Scaffold this active site. Sequence first.
Site, PDB file in Angstrom:
ATOM      1  N   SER A   1       0.869  -1.170   0.000  1.00 33.83           N
ATOM      2  CA  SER A   1       0.000   0.000   0.000  1.00 33.83           C
ATOM      3  C   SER A   1       0.910   1.225   0.000  1.00 33.83           C
ATOM      4  O   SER A   1       1.823   1.306   0.827  1.00 33.83           O
ATOM      5  CB  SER A   1      -0.876  -0.021   1.260  1.00 33.83           C
ATOM      6  OG  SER A   1      -2.051   0.758   1.113  1.00 33.83           O
ATOM      7  N   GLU A   2       0.673   2.171  -0.911  1.00 36.94           N
ATOM      8  CA  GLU A   2       1.574   3.324  -1.089  1.00 36.94           C
ATOM      9  C   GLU A   2       1.628   4.261   0.124  1.00 36.94           C
ATOM     10  O   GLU A   2       2.612   4.985   0.307  1.00 36.94           O
ATOM     11  CB  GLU A   2       1.222   4.109  -2.365  1.00 36.94           C
ATOM     12  CG  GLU A   2      -0.046   4.969  -2.278  1.00 36.94           C
ATOM     13  CD  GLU A   2      -0.602   5.410  -3.629  1.00 36.94           C
ATOM     14  OE1 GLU A   2      -0.073   5.001  -4.675  1.00 36.94           O
ATOM     15  OE2 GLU A   2      -1.585   6.175  -3.649  1.00 36.94           O
ATOM     16  N   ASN A   3       0.576   4.246   0.944  1.00 40.71           N
ATOM     17  CA  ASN A   3       0.529   5.053   2.178  1.00 40.71           C
ATOM     18  C   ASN A   3       1.314   4.489   3.378  1.00 40.71           C
ATOM     19  O   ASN A   3       1.270   5.074   4.461  1.00 40.71           O
ATOM     20  CB  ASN A   3      -0.923   5.360   2.576  1.00 40.71           C
ATOM     21  CG  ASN A   3      -1.717   4.123   2.944  1.00 40.71           C
ATOM     22  OD1 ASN A   3      -1.397   3.009   2.534  1.00 40.71           O
ATOM     23  ND2 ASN A   3      -2.780   4.323   3.704  1.00 40.71           N
TER      24      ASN A   3
END
Lengths: 467, 467, 466, 468
Positions: free
Chosen positions: C293-295
């Site tokens: 997940s990029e976050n």
Amino acid sequence: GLDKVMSLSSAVQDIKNGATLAVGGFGTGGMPHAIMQEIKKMGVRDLIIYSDGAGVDGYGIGVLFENKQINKMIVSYVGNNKIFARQYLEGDVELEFCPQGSLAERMRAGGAGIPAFYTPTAVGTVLQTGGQITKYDKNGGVLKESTPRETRFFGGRLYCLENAIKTDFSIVKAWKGDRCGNLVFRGTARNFNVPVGQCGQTVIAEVENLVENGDIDPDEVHLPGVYVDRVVVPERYQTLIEHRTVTRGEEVRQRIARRAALEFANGMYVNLGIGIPTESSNYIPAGVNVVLQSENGLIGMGPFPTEDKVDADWINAGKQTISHLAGSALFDSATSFAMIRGGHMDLTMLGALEVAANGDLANFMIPGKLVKGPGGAMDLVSCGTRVVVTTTHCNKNGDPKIVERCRLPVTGKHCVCRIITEYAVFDVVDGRLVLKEIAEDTTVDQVKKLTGVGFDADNVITMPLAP
Amino acid sequence: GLDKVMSLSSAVQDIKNGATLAVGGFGTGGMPHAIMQEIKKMGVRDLIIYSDGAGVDGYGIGVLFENKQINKMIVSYVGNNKIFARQYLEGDVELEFCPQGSLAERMRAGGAGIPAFYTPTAVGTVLQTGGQITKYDKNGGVLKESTPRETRFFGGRLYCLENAIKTDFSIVKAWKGDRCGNLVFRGTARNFNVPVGQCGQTVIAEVENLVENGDIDPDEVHLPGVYVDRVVVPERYQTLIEHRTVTRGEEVRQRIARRAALEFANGMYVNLGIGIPTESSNYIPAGVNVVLQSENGLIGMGPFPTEDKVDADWINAGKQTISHLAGSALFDSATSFAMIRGGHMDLTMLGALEVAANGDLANFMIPGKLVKGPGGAMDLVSCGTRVVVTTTHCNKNGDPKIVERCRLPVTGKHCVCRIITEYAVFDVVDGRLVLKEIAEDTTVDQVKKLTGVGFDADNVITMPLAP
Amino acid sequence: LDKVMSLSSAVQDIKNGATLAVGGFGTGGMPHAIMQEIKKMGVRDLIIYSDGAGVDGYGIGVLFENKQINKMIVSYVGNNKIFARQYLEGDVELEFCPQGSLAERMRAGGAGIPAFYTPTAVGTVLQTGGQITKYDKNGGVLKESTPRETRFFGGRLYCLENAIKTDFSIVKAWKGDRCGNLVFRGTARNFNVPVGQCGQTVIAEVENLVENGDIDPDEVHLPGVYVDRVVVPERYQTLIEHRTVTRGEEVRQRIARRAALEFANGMYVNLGIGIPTESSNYIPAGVNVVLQSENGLIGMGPFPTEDKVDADWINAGKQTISHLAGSALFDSATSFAMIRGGHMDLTMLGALEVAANGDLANFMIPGKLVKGPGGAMDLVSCGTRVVVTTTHCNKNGDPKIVERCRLPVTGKHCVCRIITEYAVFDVVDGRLVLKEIAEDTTVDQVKKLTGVGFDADNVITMPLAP
Amino acid sequence: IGLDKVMSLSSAVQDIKNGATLAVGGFGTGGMPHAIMQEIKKMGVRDLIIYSDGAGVDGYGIGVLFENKQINKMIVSYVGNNKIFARQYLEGDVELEFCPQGSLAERMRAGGAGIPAFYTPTAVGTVLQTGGQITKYDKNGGVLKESTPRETRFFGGRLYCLENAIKTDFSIVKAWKGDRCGNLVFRGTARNFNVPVGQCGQTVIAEVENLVENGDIDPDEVHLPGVYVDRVVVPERYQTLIEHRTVTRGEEVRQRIARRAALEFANGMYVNLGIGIPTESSNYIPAGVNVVLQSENGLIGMGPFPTEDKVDADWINAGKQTISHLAGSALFDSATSFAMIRGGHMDLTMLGALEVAANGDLANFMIPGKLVKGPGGAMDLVSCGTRVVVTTTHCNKNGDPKIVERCRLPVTGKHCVCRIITEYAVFDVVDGRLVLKEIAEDTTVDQVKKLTGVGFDADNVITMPLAP
Ligand SMILES: *SCCNC(=O)CCNC(=O)[C@H](O)C(C)(C)COP(=O)(O)OP(=O)(O)OC[C@H]1O[C@@H](n2cnc3c(N)ncnc32)[C@H](O)[C@@H]1OP(=O)(O)O
Ligand SMILES: CC(C)(COP(=O)(O)OP(=O)(O)OC[C@H]1O[C@@H](n2cnc3c(N)ncnc32)[C@H](O)[C@@H]1OP(=O)(O)O)[C@@H](O)C(=O)NCCC(=O)NCCS
Ligand SMILES: [Ca+2]
Ligand SMILES: [Ca+2]
Ligand SMILES: [Ca+2]
Ligand SMILES: [Ca+2]
């Protein structure tokens, strides 16, 4: 059709205090002297001046020093200008050096709409690293240092990013000009006058002869009219000759000149430095044609001229009156240093104060002692051409000139191929020295003592000399 | 001196398969035809060639297309060469475009030992972003594309980085040359022959006249001999004239040309693109005298010559025989584009395929439909100079050539200062169109439905026309 | 050290024209209490760099109401109508930046790195310039984005990104001490690490304040030297945008079931919102792949059970989420270092348009869809294999698979495989090669449903997972 | 329990073919993957190239590879107390290419982050930028190879060095704890280069000190996410080798220099103290002055030496000495540590000196031939904005002047020094030349002048105060 003629006084009156100028001239050759006097008359102050040199004592730009009209000089070579060197040391002038070929190419680039370009000149020198003493205070200490240059890799090799130069005005001298501003220069007095006329916003140009429009063949114009804003026709005067050399004890120098002369080969275009390199051209074999190249803009450079041919418009790099051989060709300073930087010479011979086992070379500077400037030296060695040093073996106090690494500041990095001396001839091979020859029945153990590095001595023939 | 003279065959014999050539010439002017013929005879192939143009059908580089001897082409303009244009479209030859001023300077730099430099030319166009089709397959579709160029800010302005061009060989043609290489050109047949001659590893020169070393004046040499390795003297032959123009229904072109000729102020140095901008040369007010600049190496371009004066070496950008005014000046193609890229032209007028409110201009291509090339257009628009576009208001289908954003590939962004049509005059202010003048005498009523965008309009006046 | 302060006292130094950096991804990690204080004392003409602009009535979004924002520099608008409205009406200026560039440029501003190179955004409108950064008051163009420099390193081209150093930096964390050490929870870390480094005066709201000594020196994420002011607002619930919980005409399912066959054992993967995320489900065989997940998370699990929901654990699509055993958290700089460095084995995205060239358009439609690059540009510009899961045609019959992208491009020459309900194409040497066809649907209909030619010489039928 | 990357010590190393570029974690011996370096010594790879901070110490870590001549080239910031490493350099067996410590860290991060290059002010105008530090000798003592130059470029007013990203065939790291799918946790200053080393490798191998199941590590406490780790090794528990077990149980000009320098501290300062004389000034801080000591190997809030029971090999300073930590101290990796330093977040850097100039130049990492150890963190610490205050003796052994006109020794940084502190006097660097501020005792003014080295301003001169 189009007229740009002015009087001397009116053309110069725009130049405000603080004005940046670009001035043509190599020594006195191509120096706009008549215009420099009128600038002195009007009394402009705080001038910033980009020029190859600074004229000489009481001539050209040199005359502006008298009433302290010079804030800054950006040049390549001081020469025999005593006022300039004094005012620099005494904190009256800011002196910024810049290699001759770069200086010409930065002017051209600033006229060409080219903001920056790369060059191998001055890479690894104090000019790239910065810190050369640009201004002194009045009492002795350093007030300002030159700022460094950007470096970048193209291929394997490192190059310096030189910025374009654009000035408020440009001062040029020409042999001939027409009313619409087409200038035609003569001999090696062309030099910087071509790139100088391009870099300037308001370029003013003195002419030794004025002609009408039509009188100049369009196929012979060196600086087209669009460049020139104001043409001036001063009263005719004789150009100053610094060294009036003509054709008509301590000669270990002759021995080097005779070995140096066996480096030449039929069809080479060469550049020879002042002193021993120039001497070696006298000892060239019978039918071995080689073309000498003077950096002020010539190929086909001859010996000193006979009395009947001495011309201020035809001088060499050391400001000596010169002749020219058949098959000759003149060119501007941007072209001249394109030719050099491009590696179009086959053999570049040069003196040296100190030459390293690296391939490094020292002459340019000694910090706060010798302040002549780089000249065309940094351009001549940083190009890919074969470089041969011709120098004595030791200093007069017995210290080696040939060393491992240079104590003195560097003219160029990893450039020297051969080192010719009165005792020996080395080749530089892989950043390390190889003893190739030694002098007449003299020993390998001797030279080993006289140089400050170890070397390969595994195949030493005896040194030959040309007659 | 040196003697570099050889046979035509023996001077070409070292050219192997896969070789890179730089080739002099603009159209047929300064095209070394005699040497390209010899290169055809010994049948070398896989040839990459750097030249402004590809010659003409069956003349110059053109003749090397007949046996499919060419792999890649690096050009600025295809010109009138059907074999070449066809061979590109049907997948046989590869074709990378280069702006003309970038191409001359890249060759000069390659000769000068300058690895890279910056130019504002072609920033924002497909030639910087990459993606012009350089090669097709045999059947129809794309095979290769142009690799992008690097960019970099100086001030707050973005510049393209152009790499140097060093070629295996260089083929040039000059009017006169001596035996130790020195070349002297004639007219606008100089162009690329100078920069081409500096950039080759082994450069070879066809000369229309041979002289002895001494017969060329050192101060008239356009290419110094050091750059020249081989000189051939082919059998004398006539240079091909593309358009033999001489001074001896339904064309709306006049209406726009007469409005545009009121942009010619006194003392201006101007450049005119081929076609419509050139035909405002008729209507310069009797008092006013401009200086026309031709990009192939001339300021002071005259009208078409009389039958007695017609010379093949004197041609314009459109390859038409041309006279020259008094006080005119010739120069090479590197200098010509240093002049243009440096903003020394006061006015620059060009044709369009599409023009926009953003200040944009699309005038060099329509994919797989009409591929001429940028030529000098990308230099002329990217410099400081005031760009005035002269186009008919709508196209051969009926659609508006003036638009919000350009459909076709861009010649330059934000470049156009004024657009001059037969219906209206627009001025770009802060990336937005402003209608200043209107014609005889279709109210805005009509003009708003003929433009492909909405525009500001308060200070409206009529459109005046010159005699 | 003790840097504890009142909410008002810390914020009071912020003058008009101030540049801020602000942490938070969506609402997770978004300092709402401090932003609300900036509203109350009413600063004008702010410049804000942040991953997004919060949400309507939350985070940075609350500052659009009185028009306190001049310029946003974000990667993603999200569900912020005020921001989207004001941009188009000409009240707010909006410069887009790829999320991976925005974090690393904040990191660079903090780390004393004046600039760096990145393959991200090369060839897109964000490199070339020309995106509308500001409209006038009538829907006419006022300002275009300034271009990025480029440079070749090795074979390929990279963008030069400049450091961003701000006047202020606002961060939010779960825990902190008086001398300024911070600890975040879940994906609510994200930009708070790099933002905290790039401000001159950096102010931190903490959900819990503890004494110096109470935080383990080994579990500090933002060291105290980076922190100038610490604030302890009154306790408030983080806004959950999509409170997700685990309790016919579906072309979408068929695409997901084919896409699920792209997963191998030991793969780390990033999947975009939608179909790429729906394929996770049909992964065949008993467990084997790691969702990134990029976050700031690896080991992204499915939706949580109704009572184990958490505001600090949300995905790229702003949905609440569980985490699997052996999962690991990191900040937004590390997240995109991981992405940009080729450490993902697969990236699956959606598209508005995809080309035979390899081009992908999925981020922006000029003056119509104001969404932005987010991670998408960083994911498609690294080495990782990029699959596109998409509908074959638009609703209305137009092909989404085209020769060249009409729309603005997310990446140049980046897509390897395109998966649709009708077909599967592979991009080889810059052109389209048809490899599979579903159902018993012929090659003849796909040829007229996709808007380009292609190789059709070894076409199997499309397999699907159960 | 998803992925299992656990693997025996022998089976993990076998892939390393001759000529392999490795990246090794650890600062000195803290975080040294020793047990892996021994298995590399066993199976026996030749002609290796190795990127690390140090090269371990004799018989420990990278140190153990020098015994069988298995290293072609080292890319390091510090030689350290490693004799075999050193000699091999001078005798001309190993190639030694220095790199600033913050540049080396950030170059490995750059490689792992897919950032091909980045700019940095470190080492501009040093022999590391210009080229010509001796990287290899022949067998006699002449130079074979030299370091190639770095590129430079202007952003704003000042010049910056282009640094290329480092990508290795393998990466070797050492962690306190790791789960089966690769997530590592570290302890104390033994994190350091392990984090950036674990990101830059194609195949990275990681020795844990404790293996645990997936789930056991808190996802929030993971320092190196498992995606980076390809193989994990669980060797027998061995003692991390303490170089200097320090604890709290001549004429001494050194103490006079320290006591003056402690008056440079101030409430709220974050400060870095270099090895030697700067560190000893921490003893003599006035009781009211609260400072936070920063150790470049990854710590703020460094304490004094610990009590005998509290000493731990994972908690060490830049001098490799065992050290305690105060309330509110925080550990971080080396990319972050030099991000912190290079970013100008320190309020005071103090450093030792071989030679310091009136210009503002400092030379404290090299004298060609004799003492060749490398920059350490020094070049980073002088090239940030932060205030440099040099602490040194006024002369050196053989009585020569340590304050000079310009440095004859290779400089650490250009125009970086703000204040020089000695037992005799304290100076200031103003505009490019020296200003005498204070003098100790009531010592003669015309004694210090020709005992100093150059001329200077001496108008406003008080006596020098020392701390209680
Ligand atoms: S250094 C000197 C180089 N200077 C340059 O300007 C080089 C680039 N310029 C050109 O190629 C020409 O000068 C152009 C811009 C094409 C001249 O255009 P004109 O202003 O003369 O307008 P014309 O319509 O007469 O153009 C000539 C041919 O181009 C076709 N054409 C123009 N516009 C369009 C559009 N919008 N769509 C399709 N075709 C278009 C015309 O059909 C015409 O064809 P011919 O075959 O020449 O009749
Ligand atoms: C330069 C440095 C050696 C200064 O030394 P110090 O620890 O402050 O203590 P001193 O000033 O007494 O000098 C220590 C040694 O250097 C010697 N020395 C001092 N000046 C010298 C000179 N001009 N020439 C040769 N040797 C010299 C001393 O005689 C002493 O020798 P010894 O250890 O063999 O007895 C020290 O700062 C250093 O090692 N720097 C390396 C880079 C760095 O800054 N690392 C720390 C980053 S946190
Ligand atoms: Ca002018
Ligand atoms: Ca040659
Ligand atoms: Ca701060
Ligand atoms: Ca890996």
